[PDB]
Amino acid sequence: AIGYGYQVKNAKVDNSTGKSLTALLQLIRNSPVYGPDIQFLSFTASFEEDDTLRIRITDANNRRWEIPNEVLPRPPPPPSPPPQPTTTVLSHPHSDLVFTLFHTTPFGFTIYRKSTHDVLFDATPIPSNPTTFLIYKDQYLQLSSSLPAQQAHLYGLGEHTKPTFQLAHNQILTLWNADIASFNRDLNLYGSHPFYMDVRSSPMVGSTHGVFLLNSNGMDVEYTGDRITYKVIGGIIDLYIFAGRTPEMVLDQYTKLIGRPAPMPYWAFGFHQCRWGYRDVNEIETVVDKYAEARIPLEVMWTDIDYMDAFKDFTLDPVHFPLDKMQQFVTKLHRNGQRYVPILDPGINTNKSYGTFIRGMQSNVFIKRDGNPYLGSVWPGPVYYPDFLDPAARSFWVDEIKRFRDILPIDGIWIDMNEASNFITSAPTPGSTLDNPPYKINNSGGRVPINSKTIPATAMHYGNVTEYNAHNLYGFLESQATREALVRTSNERPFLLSRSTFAGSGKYTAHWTGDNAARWDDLQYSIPTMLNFGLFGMPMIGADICGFAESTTEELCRRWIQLGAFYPFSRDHSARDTTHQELYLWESVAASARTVLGLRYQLLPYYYTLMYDANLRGIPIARPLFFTFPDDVATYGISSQFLIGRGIMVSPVLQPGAVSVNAYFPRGNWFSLFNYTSSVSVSAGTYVSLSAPPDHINVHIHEGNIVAMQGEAMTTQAARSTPFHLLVVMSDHVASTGELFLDNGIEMDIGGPGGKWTLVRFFAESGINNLTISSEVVNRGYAMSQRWVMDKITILGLKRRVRIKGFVVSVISDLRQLVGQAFKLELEFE
Ligand SMILES: C[C@H]1O[C@H](O[C@H]2[C@H](O)[C@@H](O)[C@@H](O[C@H]3[C@H](O)[C@@H](O)[C@@H](O[C@H]4[C@H](O)[C@@H](O)[C@@H](O[C@H]5[C@H](O)[C@@H](O)[C@@H](O)O[C@@H]5CO)O[C@@H]4CO)O[C@@H]3CO)O[C@@H]2CO)[C@H](O)[C@@H](O)[C@@H]1N[C@H]1C=C(CO)[C@@H](O)[C@H](O)[C@H]1O
Ligand SMILES: *[C@@H]1O[C@H](CO)[C@@H](O[C@@H]2O[C@H](CO)[C@@H](O)[C@H](O)[C@H]2NC(C)=O)[C@H](O[C@@H]2O[C@@H](C)[C@@H](O)[C@@H](O)[C@@H]2O)[C@H]1NC(C)=O
Ligand SMILES: *[C@@H]1O[C@H](CO)[C@@H](O)[C@H](O)[C@H]1NC(C)=O
Numbered sequence: 001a002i003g004y005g006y007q008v009k010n011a012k013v014d015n016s017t018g019k020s021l022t023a024l025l026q027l028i029r030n031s032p033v034y035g036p037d038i039q040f041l042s043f044t045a046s047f048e049e050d051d052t053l054r055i056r057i058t059d060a061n062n063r064r065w066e067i068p069n070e071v072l073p074r075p076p077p078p079p080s081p082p083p084q085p086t087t088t089v090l091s092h093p094h095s096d097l098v099f100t101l102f103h104t105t106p107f108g109f110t111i112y113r114k115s116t117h118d119v120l121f122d123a124t125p126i127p128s129n130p131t132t133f134l135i136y137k138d139q140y141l142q143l144s145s146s147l148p149a150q151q152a153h154l155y156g157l158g159e160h161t162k163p164t165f166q167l168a169h170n171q172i173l174t175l176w177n178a179d180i181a182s183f184n185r186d187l188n189l190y191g192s193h194p195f196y197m198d199v200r201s202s203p204m205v206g207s208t209h210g211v212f213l214l215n216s217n218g219m220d221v222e223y224t225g226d227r228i229t230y231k232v233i234g235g236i237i238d239l240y241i242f243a244g245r246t247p248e249m250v251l252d253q254y255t256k257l258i259g260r261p262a263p264m265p266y267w268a269f270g271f272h273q274c275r276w277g278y279r280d281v282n283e284i285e286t287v288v289d290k291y292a293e294a295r296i297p298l299e300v301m302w303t304d305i306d307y308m309d310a311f312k313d314f315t316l317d318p319v320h321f322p323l324d325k326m327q328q329f330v331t332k333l334h335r336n337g338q339r340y341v342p343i344l345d346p347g348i349n350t351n352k353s354y355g356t357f358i359r360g361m362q363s364n365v366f367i368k369r370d371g372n373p374y375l376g377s378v379w380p381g382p383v384y385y386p387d388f389l390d391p392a393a394r395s396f397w398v399d400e401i402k403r404f405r406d407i408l409p410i411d412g413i414w415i416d417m418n419e420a421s422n423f424i425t426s427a428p429t430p431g432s433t434l435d436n437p438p439y440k441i442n443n444s445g446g447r448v449p450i451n452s453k454t455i456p457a458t459a460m461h462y463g464n465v466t467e468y469n470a471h472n473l474y475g476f477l478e479s480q481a482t483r484e485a486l487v488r489t490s491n492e493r494p495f496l497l498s499r500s501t502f503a504g505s506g507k508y509t510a511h512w513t514g515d516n517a518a519r520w521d522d523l524q525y526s527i528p529t530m531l532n533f534g535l536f537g538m539p540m541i542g543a544d545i546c547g548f549a550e551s552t553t554e555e556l557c558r559r560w561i562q563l564g565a566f567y568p569f570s571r572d573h574s575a576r577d578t579t580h581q582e583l584y585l586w587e588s589v590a591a592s593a594r595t596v597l598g599l600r601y602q603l604l605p606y607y608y609t610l611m612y613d614a615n616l617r618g619i620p621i622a623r624p625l626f627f628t629f630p631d632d633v634a635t636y637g638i639s640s641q642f643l644i645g646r647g648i649m650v651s652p653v654l655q656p657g658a659v660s661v662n663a664y665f666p667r668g669n670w671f672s673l674f675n676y677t678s679s680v681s682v683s684a685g686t687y688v689s690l691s692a693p694p695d696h697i698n699v700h701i702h703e704g705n706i707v708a709m710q711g712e713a714m715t716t717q718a719a720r721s722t723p724f725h726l727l728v729v730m731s732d733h734v735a736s737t738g739e740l741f742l743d744n745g746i747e748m749d750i751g752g753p754g755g756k757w758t759l760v761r762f763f764a765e766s767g768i769n770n771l772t773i774s775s776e777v778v779n780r781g782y783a784m785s786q787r788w789v790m791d792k793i794t795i796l797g798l799k800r801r802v803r804i805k806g807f808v809v810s811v812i813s814d815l816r817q818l819v820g821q822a823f824k825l826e827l828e829f830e
């Protein structure tokens with residue numbers, strides 16, 4: 001059949017130092033299928049941290065493609081080996097993870113938990129079944145693990161649109177960056193994230209680990225419920241297991257490896273407006289004016305490829321978007337506390353009188369094939385693609401951005417079309433097994449050739465690196481270069497949004513779900529996708545509100561702003577061939593927008609703190625219910641509700657004509673953020689049928705949490721000048737806590753040694769006859785200098801009212817306290 005697998009020829013754990021395991025594997029027998037077997041494998045197992053195990057399988061006899069350390073820096077590998085059945089075990093005393101090598105024919109290995117003896121990853125073959133073997137051919141790597149089908153709940157392996165967050169059994173997930181619209185279910189999309197989270201329902205419910213394959217090649221991942229199998233068309237096996245044991249711990253461990261989420265400027269949490277098709281500077285000015293007139297907050301105005309001179313980067317349409325008017329426009333935005341973001345594509349038009357093209361040629365920055373620059377097709381027509389693996393191309397990129405920024409101020413950059421997208425598929429190179437690989441991955445759901453509508457696999461990058469190997473890194477690399485350009489041309493914290501991504505992209509950029517559609521399905525689809533990118537270490541995520549493609553309806557757009565006002569990244573965007581969909585256009589949507597964006601803006605200090613938490617520990621802003629409630633198995637399959645931070649839950653209507661929603665509530669007390677008198681109390685988690693009128697969305701806060709809020713305003717800058725209102729939700733079972741991070745909104749290194757920041761922790765507890773609310777402050781200086789005052793505290797979750805020396809609501813007014821000054825407030829019961 002497909003292969004015969006490997007035997008352990010030798011294996012040993014180095015002793016008398018930090019243990020690592022080294023083994024040599026030998027091919028049992030050759031097979032012709034999918035090409036030549038690699039005869040000898042080097043096999044290592046090593047602990048990068050007590051909570052992280054690394055399994056690396058390479059050709060013992062040849063260097064193979066690996067993601068460069070410069071692209072994704074990480075600890076180097078453990079030495080390689082020398083030139084009942086037997087086993088070799090690797091364990092560390094402070095590690096919960098135990099690795100075992102089985103000297104069977106073919107060989108196997110497992111990783112199990114010390115605490116429960118539960119097997120997390122099991123690559124023991126079924127001897128009669130080659131689909132369960134490790135197979136290792138030049139263009140076909142096969143790695144398989146069994147799974148306890150009912151107990152293992154898996155999440156991730158992006159990027160794909162799915163109706164559920166938890167991965168359905170019996171499917172194939174393809175990772176191959178492609179310009180494919182996210183309104184398409186199942187298909188491989190713009191990004192590739194070969195990570196999954198595995199939550200176990202038994203034996204120790206809520207027990208979670210992570211599994212990451214550090215490989216940039218195209219792959220199919222087959223998940224059948226009782227097994228998962230990687231089928232990878234190149235590179236090596238570089239497998240990381242993250243011990244958890246909680247969901248939050250897994251993401252901490254994973255992002256520690258791939259990079260902590262980049263911080264975001266405060267303004268990026270404001271509302272964004274964009275459209276493909278804005279005709280001229282007058283129109284975008286008019287949109288901004290109409291937002292103000294509708295009294296709907298607008299933070300950032302975007303321009304799509306319309307602004308460019310005939311779709312060429314680093315230029316302005318001299319007729320529709322003349323430089324002087326654009327300068328005035330951006331100046332006006334800035335005077336009003338607003339910001340501006342333009343789009344960029346990677347392809348450089350081949351026009352001989354275009355400065356960017358001339359300079360690019362001079363520094364030889366473009367991707368080549370057969371010794372000449374590769375000629376693609378995108379919006380301006382013929383293009384060459386910068387090789388972002390080439391240091392000279394990055395410098396070129398920085399320089400073009402500098403030049404443009406010197407003439408027209410910008411606040412951030414949107415990088416699109418960077419898979420790379422190509423509108424003409426090139427002919428395959430005769431005889432090449434790269435353009436015509438032996439195993440066809442399921443590209444676009446049709447086994448479509450990998451070179452379809454992109455750069456051909458035989459194209460070459462700096463260092464003689466093939467497109468075959470580097471493809472999934474293109475977007476990732478451009479993001480690094482663009483961020484580099486921004487940091488070098490402004491001392492403000494940068495902001496960028498990227499379409500194409502790879503594992504680690506979150507260290508450089510925000511992301512959006514791409515080309516969704518104005519359909520009720522896509523409204524719901526935004527939630528699983530939002531949650532996934534949190535797992536992928538990209539917490540700054542959202543979808544085009546009201547839908548990118550196809551014309552929206554009043555009701556759909558109304559329900560969408562309700563949901564979308566809570567996306568970490570909240571933007572209205574649409575294609576040019578559809579109806580306009582600014583939020584002021586319908587009264588019922590505008591009224592809904594004011595209500596929900598009003599709450600969002602009050603929650604800005606909360607979002608910003610969560611962003612801080614994400615950069616620190618990798619924990620997502622928008623997170624699944626089982627992150628807070630991992631012991632409640634009912635939450636594992638929830639796909640239509642989500643948390644913002646630890647204790648706020650959003651429960652949107654996602655169907656037309658509905659005025660109610662059946663929403664799951666985990667155990668305990670929940671209070672509407674829109675009406676503190678409105679609450680939900682259960683002794684055991686269950687579904688509750690919430691009232692949900694056309695203009696309302698259910699948003700609830702759980703007992704045990706404290707959230708610092710500021711006032712509503714038209715801009716994020718204005719909001720920060722409002723008083724703080726503290727929301728304290730008490731629990732009979734636990735003291736309540738909360739956190740607030742404060743800085744200047746633009747410090748390059750968030751929470752760094754520079755000291756331009758303050759951290760406040762809040763604490764509240766009831767006694768039999770008193771109630772204490774207090775704070776602790778780290779680095780009091782910055783916050784004090786900003787004059788932030790807390791004037792009111794609202795207390796939920798008690799059945800008795802409290803004051804200074806069913807549920808009730810208590811309010812403490814005219815407090816005038818300074819946020820920067822630690823306090824202790826004593827209240828008494830009535
Ligand atoms: C504005 C955006 O324009 C482009 O994207 C467009 C396409 O150009 C357009 O044709 C269309 O494409 C859709 C199809 O309509 C839809 O049917 C689906 O195609 C599927 C197909 O259904 C499915 O069967 C499968 O086809 C296989 C088949 O399985 C197999 O057996 C065999 O037959 O082969 C076929 C074909 O390979 O897969 C198809 C997908 O490949 O989905 C496609 C979308 O992929 O709509 C899209 C989306 O609008 C550009 O590509 C986009 O990049 C562009 N959007 C960007 C541009 C901007 C402007 O600057 C910016 O505003 C946007 O934000 C940005 O995203
Ligand atoms: C090279 O870039 C030039 C600058 O943008 C292009 O010329 C401009 O084309 C606009 C329409 O695309 C037109 O409104 C502008 O007036 C014009 N500006 C100037 C200074 O010529 C040029 O476009 C080519 O030449 C024009 C005359 C048309 O024939 C276009 O169809 C051509 O593409 C660009 N040339 C190429 C080869 O890309
Ligand atoms: C707040 O909720 C309570 C209970 O659900 C309800 O009786 C009251 O009318 C609501 N108030 C407003 C202003 O909606």
Ligand SMILES: *[C@@H]1O[C@H](CO)[C@@H](O)[C@H](O)[C@H]1NC(C)=O
Nearest residue numbers: 767769770771826827828829
């Ligand atoms: C609450 O506790 C404080 C300190 O323990 C005490 O001084 C005070 O008398 C108490 N209040 C009441 C109403 O008993």
